[PDB]
Design a protein around this nucleic acid. Structure first.
Ligand SMILES: [Mg+2]
Ligand SMILES: [Mg+2]
Ligand SMILES: [Mg+2]
Ligand SMILES: [Mg+2]
Ligand SMILES: [Mg+2]
Ligand SMILES: [Mg+2]
Ligand SMILES: [Mg+2]
Ligand SMILES: [Mg+2]
Ligand SMILES: [Mg+2]
Ligand SMILES: [Mg+2]
Ligand SMILES: [Mg+2]
Ligand SMILES: [Mg+2]
Ligand SMILES: [Mg+2]
Ligand SMILES: [Mg+2]
Ligand SMILES: [Mg+2]
Ligand SMILES: [Mg+2]
Ligand SMILES: [Mg+2]
Ligand SMILES: [Mg+2]
Lengths: 96, 106, 53, 67, 223
RNA sequence: GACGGAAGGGCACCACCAGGAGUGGAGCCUGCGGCUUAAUUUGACUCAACACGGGGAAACUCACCAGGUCCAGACACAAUAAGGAUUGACAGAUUGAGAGCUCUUUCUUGAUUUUGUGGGUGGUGGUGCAUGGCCGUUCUUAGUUGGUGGAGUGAUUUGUCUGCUUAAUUGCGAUAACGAACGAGACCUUAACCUACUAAAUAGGGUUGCUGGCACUUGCCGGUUGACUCUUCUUAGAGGGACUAUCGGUUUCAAGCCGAUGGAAGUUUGAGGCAAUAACAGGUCUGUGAUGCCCUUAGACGUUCUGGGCCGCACGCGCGCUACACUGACGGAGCCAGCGAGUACAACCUUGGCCGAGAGGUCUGGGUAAUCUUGUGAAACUCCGUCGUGCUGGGGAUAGAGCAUUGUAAUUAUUGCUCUUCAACGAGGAAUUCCUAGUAAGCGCAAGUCAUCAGCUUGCGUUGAUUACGUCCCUGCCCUUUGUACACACC
């Protein structure tokens, strides 16, 4: 729960970029893939997010799955300052 | 202008044998229509993958054992051909379940 | 965040985790499956495994 | 313990009922005929049926049988 | 990329299984049944079957895209290399898994269990299956665990006319008083089955004979 | 219905004949005891527990114990609100300790929190009689319904049976039943046959180049990816093939069974896989982010480190292995499989060559695999010599010593080989296990395990018989008839 806030911010940014986050059920792991943060920290953050709505969670097969709801998206926007017409995965980037 | 013979191996691996056979047949037909020198749908020792297990979740009954086996079918299709023709062939020639793989070069 | 929170767990039944439950109990490492056998004996049909003989 | 099952026997009986001609005593022809006329999802079963039909034919040379 | 062929195949199978499990978990509301993986060079197609296809789709690229992203994250592949399609299943009645899911949903919301089972059976029959069977194990009023078998038509228990003929679905249903378990075995009709044999392996059916008139004078018919 | 210390039928090498091979004996290795312990964690207990929990645990495992460490007390509400909420902090003390664990000092740290109150999550904690799921067991026995009919006021029953066959409720026949279904069968995979098809410098075999070795003449035997063609063997693919076939009698010349002939194959062709109806208060909540409830919860049953322990011994029982000799023993020497499985983002299977008596190492490889380890040149077996029925050269058990190797970690030898010590045991009492053909037994190999370990399991070959080819006498079940004051059903 005691998160060096920069790391948390980075995690949030990553989430916003993606629209989706996949976490290992691996505590004791030194560093998560992609983000230069500890898996555990990420998991904690996502748990926190879930506990106040925002994110839908799955524990399936030693893998946590994280999809962001509309309220969640709004909250993320508020956190990051980015205004409107932005990434996640609510709509396609172009023709893909 | 080109036509430089490379000799190309095609791998055909899968489980559902019928599908594999069909694919092989299709490939041979295609080869015939493009008219090439080719070695046939060479078959390898169809590898069984055995996993034998206590049927009991917990080791309290009679000692029932099950061999869960995976039949695998490995096929080599050798072509005396350039690469362009192979590419043309592999534009289609894909059917669900079966693995199409091009080794390329002799 | 503590400095000493890991044993040298390179091998043994510790490092070897299952793909479903994460068990250290009866782990079919064979073929690079890494499953606790019980679960496999339920999912095997989808894993392409069948019993014939 | 090679007692032919109910099913095979029944099939043979049916065959004899519907196609008493075209059952030329010996096995091989009869087998083929069975394969043609009766639809069997197997091969061994078909063979068995053929055998039973042949037996029936042999019997029916040496008198009338019940059913 | 690239391992031993056998090993690769095993891994693929495992992946498929995992995916199936995820879809059972994630797309629970979506009424999911089956996954149909097609792996080609570059673009890997993943077909997904459900009752409520609209839900799966979302509002044009909603849930499906998220799922794709998740898949990518799981198995290292990039955007475009994995494609996901959601489809209508051709009559859900023959499909056991879908039926099981429906039953579970009926249970969870609040309905008569026996009656629900009967309804399901009726639906299956209407669809056109040769027979079907529902088993409901657990507490169905009172503490002692009770099995409840409900069936229609034939149900082949033995033989290779099972792996080819009977779709089986096992589910756990979670309740406040205790966990129910719903098993459902469905007898698909031989003809509509298409894959494998088109009739039951024991059965023998013979056609009707055709009449021919003998003698009528030998005669000659010339051209 | 169940039951009987009732009556008959009828099965079954989990019954017995006729046999074998044995186990209990002996030494050990390994469960289970019973103790004992800091803790020796536990789950089982007739078949249906006891080399089983894939349980061959050096830590991990891990469930146990003695201790340290940590929060992974989500969110909801308040006191601090930076003049400070806060994490750290080498030196040495402190301290199993390059754990600032905490106290000293005095720099940081940046409202994430600190700590309470509502609340939750975690648990190899409990409950398997709250369960699901799976499994086991009745039983892989031959059972089990239902439709229409009959007998019944009914519950029910007949059908499903006096008999004769079958591996079989398998069938024939008798017959208020008739035709049905599930189960048995059929099916399915494999093991067998194809000198007919499909093809193969990844399986093979031929003819000639180059030459290697000869007899010395033409001819042998080779090696060599040279070239060429074939496909017997190898491989699979497609089919076919056996249907008890052909007669011989037997039995109402039914169902079928036995004998000869042919045939690759006449025990359901062998082996399974699947497996009904209902269950058992059978097994697991120690496979689970399968789980109802109860428990606990931050000086924790959550976690994680450090060490031990599950391997203790006065002794019970059950798996096994090795021995008790000349069917030997040890050297030589000959020399033969089949399943297997095996790495690139790593620490695989590892050839081949020098150094080491072994154990092994090293430089180069080849193999993400019919291609390389690999003809896995395995053992058992087959020849000659040496010793010839001595607790002996049978047997290698209690043990000391080095070198290695695995892994941070080997003492409580992990294991390995070498020299040694060289014991119990001269064919195993009462009981009883397993078996009817490539079956029994022997003999290895491989995989599962796995950093390391095999005496264990799965598998696969390799040698390869005795005696039945029956019957209910014993044991267990099964159905009928009988009786019953039992139906939570004789505990
Ligand atoms: Mg059947
Ligand atoms: Mg069967
Ligand atoms: Mg028994
Ligand atoms: Mg050990
Ligand atoms: Mg748990
Ligand atoms: Mg129980
Ligand atoms: Mg009536
Ligand atoms: Mg009756
Ligand atoms: Mg006779
Ligand atoms: Mg059989
Ligand atoms: Mg009990
Ligand atoms: Mg629990
Ligand atoms: Mg133990
Ligand atoms: Mg045992
Ligand atoms: Mg080989
Ligand atoms: Mg001596
Ligand atoms: Mg073992
Ligand atoms: Mg009386």
């Amino acid at each position: 729960m005691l998160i060096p806030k920069e790391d948390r911010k980075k995690i949030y940014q990553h989430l916003f970029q993606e629209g989706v986050l996949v976490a290992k059920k691996d505590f004791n792991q030194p560093k998560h893939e992609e983000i230069d943060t500890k898996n555990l920290f990420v998991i904690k953050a996502l748990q926190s997010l879930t506990s106040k709505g925002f994110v839908k969670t799955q524990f399936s097969w030693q893998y946590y799955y994280y999809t962001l709801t509309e309220e969640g998206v709004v909250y993320l926007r508020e956190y990051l300052n980015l205004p409107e017409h932005i990434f996640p995965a609510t709509y396609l980037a172009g023709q893909s | 202008q080109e036509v430089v013979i490379h000799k190309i191996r095609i791998n055909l691996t899968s489980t559902k044998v019928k599908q594999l056979e069909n694919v092989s047949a299709n490939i041979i037909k295609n080869a015939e229509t493009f008219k090439l020198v080719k070695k046939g749908p060479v078959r390898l020792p169809t590898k069984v993958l055995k996993i034998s297990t206590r049927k009991t979740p917990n080791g309290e009954g009679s000692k029932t054992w099950d061999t869960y086996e995976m039949r695998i079918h490995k096929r080599y299709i050798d072509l005396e051909a350039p690469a362009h023709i192979v590419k043309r062939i592999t534009q289609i020639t894909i059917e669900p379940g079966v693995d199409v793989e091009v080794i390329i070069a002799a | 965040e503590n400095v000493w929170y890991s044993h040298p767990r390179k091998f043994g039944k510790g490092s070897r985790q299952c793909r479903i439950s994460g068990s250290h109990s009866g782990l079919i490492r064979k073929y690079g499956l890494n499953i606790d056998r019980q679960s496999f004996r339920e999912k095997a049909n989808d894993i392409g495994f069948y019993k014939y003989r | 313990g090679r007692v032919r099952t109910k099913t095979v026997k029944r099939a043979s009986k049916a065959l004899i009922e519907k196609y008493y001609p075209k059952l030329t005593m010996d096995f091989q022809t009869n087998k083929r005929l069975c394969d043609e006329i009766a639809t069997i999802q197997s091969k061994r079963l078909r063979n068995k049926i053929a055998g039973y039909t042949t037996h029936l034919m042999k019997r029916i040379q040496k008198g009338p049988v019940r059913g | 990329a690239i391992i031993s062929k056998k090993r690769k195949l095993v891994a693929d199978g495992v992946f498929y299984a995992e995916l199936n499990e995820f879809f059972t978990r994630e797309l629970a509301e979506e009424g999911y049944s089956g996954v149909e993986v097609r792996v080609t060079p570059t673009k890997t197609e993943i077909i997904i079957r459900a009752t409520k296809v609209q839900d799966v789709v979302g509002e044009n690229g909603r849930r499906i895209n998220e799922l794709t992203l998740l898949i990518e994250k799981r198995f290292k592949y990039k955007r475009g290399t994995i494609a996901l399609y959601a489809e209508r299943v051709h009559d859900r009645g023959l499909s056991a898994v879908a039926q099981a899911e429906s039953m579970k949903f009926k249970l969870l919301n609040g309905l008569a269990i026996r009656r629900a089972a009967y309804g399901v059976v009726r639906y299956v029959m209407e669809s056109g299956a040769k027979g079907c069977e529902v088993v409901i194990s657990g507490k169905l009023r009172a503490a002692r665990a009770k099995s409840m078998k409900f069936a229609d038509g034939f149900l082949i228990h033995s033989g290779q006319p099972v792996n080819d003929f009977i779709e089986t679905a096992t589910r756990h249903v979670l309740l406040r008083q205790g966990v129910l378990g719903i098993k459902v075995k469905i007898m698909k009709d031989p003809s509509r089955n298409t894959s494998g044999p088109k009739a039951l392996p024991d059965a023998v059916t013979i056609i009707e004979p055709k009449e021919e008139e003998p003698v009528l004078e030998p005669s000659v018919k010339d051209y």
